[PDB]
Amino acid sequence: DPSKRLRELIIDFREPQFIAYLSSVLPHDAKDTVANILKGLNKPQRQAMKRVLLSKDYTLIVGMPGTGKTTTICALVRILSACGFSVLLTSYTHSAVDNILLKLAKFKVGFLRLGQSHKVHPDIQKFTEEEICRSRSIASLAHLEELYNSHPIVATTCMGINHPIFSRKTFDFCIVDEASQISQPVCLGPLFFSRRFVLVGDHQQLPPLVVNREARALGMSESLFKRLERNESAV
Amino acid sequence: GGHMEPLDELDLLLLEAVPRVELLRKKADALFPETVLSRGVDNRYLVLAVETSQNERGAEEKRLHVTASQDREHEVLCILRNGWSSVPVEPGDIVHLEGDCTSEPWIIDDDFGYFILYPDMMISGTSVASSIRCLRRAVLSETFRGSDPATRQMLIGTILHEVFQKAISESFAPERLQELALQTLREVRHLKEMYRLNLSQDEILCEVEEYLPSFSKWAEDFMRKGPSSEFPQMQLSLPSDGRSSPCNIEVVKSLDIEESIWSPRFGLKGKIDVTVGVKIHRDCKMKYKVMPLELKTGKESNSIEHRSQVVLYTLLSQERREDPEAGWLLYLKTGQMYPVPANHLDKRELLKLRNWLAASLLHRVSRAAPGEEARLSALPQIIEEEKTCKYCSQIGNCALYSRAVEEQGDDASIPEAMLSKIQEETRHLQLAHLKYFSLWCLMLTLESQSKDNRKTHQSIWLTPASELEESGNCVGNLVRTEPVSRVCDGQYLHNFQRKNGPMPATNLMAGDRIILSGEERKLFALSKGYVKKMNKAAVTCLLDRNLSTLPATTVFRLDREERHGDISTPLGNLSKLMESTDPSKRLRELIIDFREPQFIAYLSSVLPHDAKDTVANILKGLNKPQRQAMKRVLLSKDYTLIVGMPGTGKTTTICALVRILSACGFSVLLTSYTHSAVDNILLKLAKFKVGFLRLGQSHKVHPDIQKFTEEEICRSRSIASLAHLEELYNSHPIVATTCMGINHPIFSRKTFDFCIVDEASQISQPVCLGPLFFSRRFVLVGDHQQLPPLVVNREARALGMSESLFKRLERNESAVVQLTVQYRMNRKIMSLSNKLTYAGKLECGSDRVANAVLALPNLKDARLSLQLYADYSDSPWLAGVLEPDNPVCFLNTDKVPAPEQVENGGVSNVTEARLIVFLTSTFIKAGCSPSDIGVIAPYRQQLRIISDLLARSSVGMVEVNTVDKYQGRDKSLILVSFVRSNEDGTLGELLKDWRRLNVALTRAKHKLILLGSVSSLKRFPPLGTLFDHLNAEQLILDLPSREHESLSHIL
DNA sequence: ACTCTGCCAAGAGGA
Ligand SMILES: Nc1ncnc2c1ncn2[C@@H]1O[C@H](COP(=O)(O)OP(=O)(O)O)[C@@H](O)[C@H]1O
Ligand SMILES: Nc1ncnc2c1ncn2[C@@H]1O[C@H](COP(=O)(O)OP(=O)(O)O)[C@@H](O)[C@H]1O
Ligand code: SF4
Ligand SMILES: [Ca+2]
Ligand SMILES: [Ca+2]
């Protein structure tokens, strides 16, 4: 069923659904915390949070240059976390994902970072599986599990989808930063592990790089963000 | 009976008397005890005779002789015709007639009347409905109740039922429905099932949402306000007119939600989803009927099963209101609503089918002749229909039961394709496995079917609350005026005052399972629940239903839910043990085939390096046997048996093991049978700042452990999302629950490195199995010299049912570690059980423990105060009793006439009672805190006597209890009234038990006083042996005659 | 021949 649903949304362009706003959209006890986050945001930013909360499928956030992509994703992650959702946070590059995490660290939001620690920002390294294992002498299956379950927010790159965690966990949401720069079948990867998803991108900026002329002629630089953009109601 | 050899035998063996009536009255009693036979609406008739014959027309008919008096005054001839002739009724059965006989050759046939076999067995309508396609499936469903597992479709269904039920009170406006869906999806009860099933929260919300427009279409058609011709036209022909002319159906309102009904008229029970007020419009005219509505999610089938359920609901309704004559089936998927008329033919066939189910559920034990060995009875035959069996969720148990228990003696008869299917299903099992499963099913059934687990609800629906108020278990003349507050739906707090002379004179403690009825017969079995507070003015209960629909005018009655002998958990455990998975195979091999548990030799690398120091610090605190127990566990590949002899610090030892395992990074499932045992370990672990999660209902849990429960954390932290619930379940490697709590969703998703079972030697063996399915290795803590699991049935006990799992595994000596250092008893008290029971193995943990004596600061003064009553100056017995340097003392009552009183199968001794009450006063006056004193007696009846006399002497606060209620506990001073004292020599079986005595002799820290008749008691092997040891050190002191000055003021 | 603690429960669909 998860693959069928993705084929229908991505291949057959089935219209993504959204409900009308109601008091009960967010768990009652989260409402105030979310309000305080929203107040900090500008109107388009708030409108992006709203669209995500109302979605049944996906949301496309167009981050035009200088609009504070990392601020906006950080804020969304805070809202989702306050709501008690689990979140899979991804991008193609290490430093993009790490940029969001630096902000989230400042807000004392917990997350686990997967990946080899030498590829990771120095101030994010202490949050990695690798460093926590070394630092805490993890040497038992139950302690390893404990680490994997310790944060609803799990952060990795798009290519990191072979981690054992993805054989065992699914997420309420996946967020993909830089979705308009990522090769469409690479962008698919995290999407198998979440119910709903959010792509952040800008098709007026650089597309995935495709070196072969014939492949480019066939459509290979159409990012997943771009493909989904005909569904205006998600944008 | 007798086997004849000459012709004289044949002549004299000819019988005929009337004593066959008693043979059946006893038989009826064995399964429906204390059933008062009567005439009228709730008639009860005992069957005396049954004969099949040919009718005036050449066809089969059954005739019965019945009576509605315990007296042999009436014999009524009842005749059962057509289909009714095949009712499997036997002489000795309790029956009820729908239509009590007014005429004297009473006929029940295809056209008129119902015959109800065992009216007091209330069978759920859904079981009856499911028995249509297969009787055997229905019986298997009723017995192995957790073999139809929770599905995704079933969760959807549950949620949608709740949304519809919230909506029909409020509104079906789309925005309100969406609201209700959003809120319902976050309820923990639903989140738990999503977790169980590993589903995504929003996926389930989406599925629920797809249905909402159908909810609105339905309400649009049936609940719109408008012209009566605008409601949907149907044909709905009821016995009430003369009809057969289409009419318009309007649903006015819901009158009720989730209405549960017990029917002692039909032997039925059920839950009506929604009770509706309906207007039936026809030719400008209107009729209003109150009708049952059944909600169904999934396929719109209008099936025989579905329709039959509704028909049964219209029967159930007659117990509350007038016959609705029909009900409604609503398929929520499409909003389609189908009328279900309840014809005589349908009710007839359905109640015939209910009789067969009642019969098959009741006749579980076969007996070759009366007094030969018990066997399990065959289930109803495996059926011919391939299609039915293929889709059947009970196939595992069906094949299992076929192969283990009923396996053909001469004739198979089973369909060949089904026959080889049995083979496929059961081929993984060995002979010993089949035998074990079969033996434990029989013993469990015997124990389940025992007379104490058999009492009926008759007393509630027949005798007024007036009669049982002078008994200890019922209260009547109750009322409510206050608003009904709610904790979470399924819990509703109700306040009940007396509005009359305040009647709390009843035996009913808080946390007691109770059944609320109205005193009006038409308001029987309104709600189950427990009692929270028990004031002298009022009584407050948490009940599953909101009873504000009822007028303030109604008068209520409280009645206790008695032990019906539920065995579904242990049966479930046995079934699970027979499954073809590696974890089950490994348990069969260890438990059934006694495969030797393995252990490695110790090495540096046994524990993770970084844990070694932390573990060392824990070990240093322990004594040598304790350390040795930790070591055995760490070296095991299978299990470990820790023998916790009395006073050896069971809870200290388990706490320490849990710390070691936790430091090592293992996950641990911590269990016992009782709440307070598990809670006792947790109190220690809390002090060591070790984290754990506690499962279970928070009101059953120790006050200082409540904050650690799932329930409190959910409330306290507003958990309202699947991910937050998961987070709570994963937050601690240590999970703590009772043995019966194995149905928690966590066990569908998690496994543990280790399971620890406290009190394993007190737990029924198939109950002890339950947690063991969820861990790789296990640890049982117990002592087979202490009390075994209680088994009330003699035959089951004879078959081996009190062998605990701890005991069974003990032949594997290499797994056994004995805790022998004890911190309870002084050298003299310990010495006693060391001689009687523990073969010298117990040691005092210190000089302080060894040399401790009863602290009596005010002895001189208390001693002097006695002189007012009699001359105790130079009294052999009294000085001996009071002397702290005399820790063990036996008071022989032979010279004081101190006989027993026997009433109702229990035993008392007034004289013994007066003696301990005196002794207890003297000790309190001497400076012993009342909380440091425990009174034990073997017989439950004696305790009542002791309790009363202590109340009378202003000294009620000393604990008075049986041996069983002192398990694992101690007191400074223990006084034992060994009640038995008689001339004629009637011995119980109770005092024959070595373990019972052992537990009595080991509850005392400092002083132990024993009282009874040496000449009566010495006839019991444990006491005889006790007397040999007490004598060898002159510890038996003879009381004088009751006339003597030192006793006369007491006696 | 007398000793008693645990489970929420009838149905949530499947055809
Ligand atoms: N809602 C907002 N209100 C005020 N300032 C904002 C908002 N969103 C973004 N900004 C500003 O715009 C910049 C966004 O860039 P970004 O890459 O998100 O963060 P930074 O560059 O601070 O790491 C920030 O420096 C911040 O000052
Ligand atoms: N290894 C040990 N060293 C010293 N004292 C012990 C040891 N094990 C048990 N004890 C003592 O014996 C008693 C054991 O009883 P237990 O039920 O385990 O704990 P408590 O009664 O303190 O709750 C404790 O009071 C404790 O003082
Ligand atoms: S398998 Fe066939 S026979 Fe066995 S119970 Fe299920 S339906 Fe009845
Ligand atoms: Ca229903
Ligand atoms: Ca149902």
Numbering used by the authors:
A (entry chain A): 587 to 821
B (entry chain A): -2 to 13, 20 to 245, 248 to 1056
Reported in the publication:
Dna2 has nuclease and helicase activities and plays key roles in maintaining genomic integrity. It is involved in the nucleolytic processing of 5’ flaps during Okazaki fragment maturation, of DNA double-strand breaks (DSBs) during homologous-recombination mediated repair, and of stalled replication forks in the intra-S-phase checkpoint. Dna2 contains a PD-(D/E)XK superfamily nuclease motif and a 5’ to 3’ helicase domain.
We determined the 2.3 Å crystal structure of full-length mouse Dna2 (residues 1 to 1062) bound to a ssDNA substrate of 21 nucleotides (nts), 15 of which are well ordered. The overall structure has a cylindrical shape with a central tunnel through which the ssDNA threads. The ssDNA is positioned with its 5’ end at the helicase domain, and its 3’ end at the nuclease domain. A 7-nt segment at the 5’ end contacts first the helicase 2A domain outside the tunnel and then the 1A domain inside the tunnel. The DNA crosses over from the helicase to the nuclease domains over the next two nucleotides, which are in the vicinity of the β barrel domain in the middle of the tunnel, but do not make any protein contacts. Here, the first three nucleotides are fully enclosed by the tunnel, while the last three nucleotides contact the tunnel opening. The base groups of the 6 nt segment stack in two sets of three, with Met157 and other crossover loop side chains wedging in between the Ade12 and Gua13 base groups.
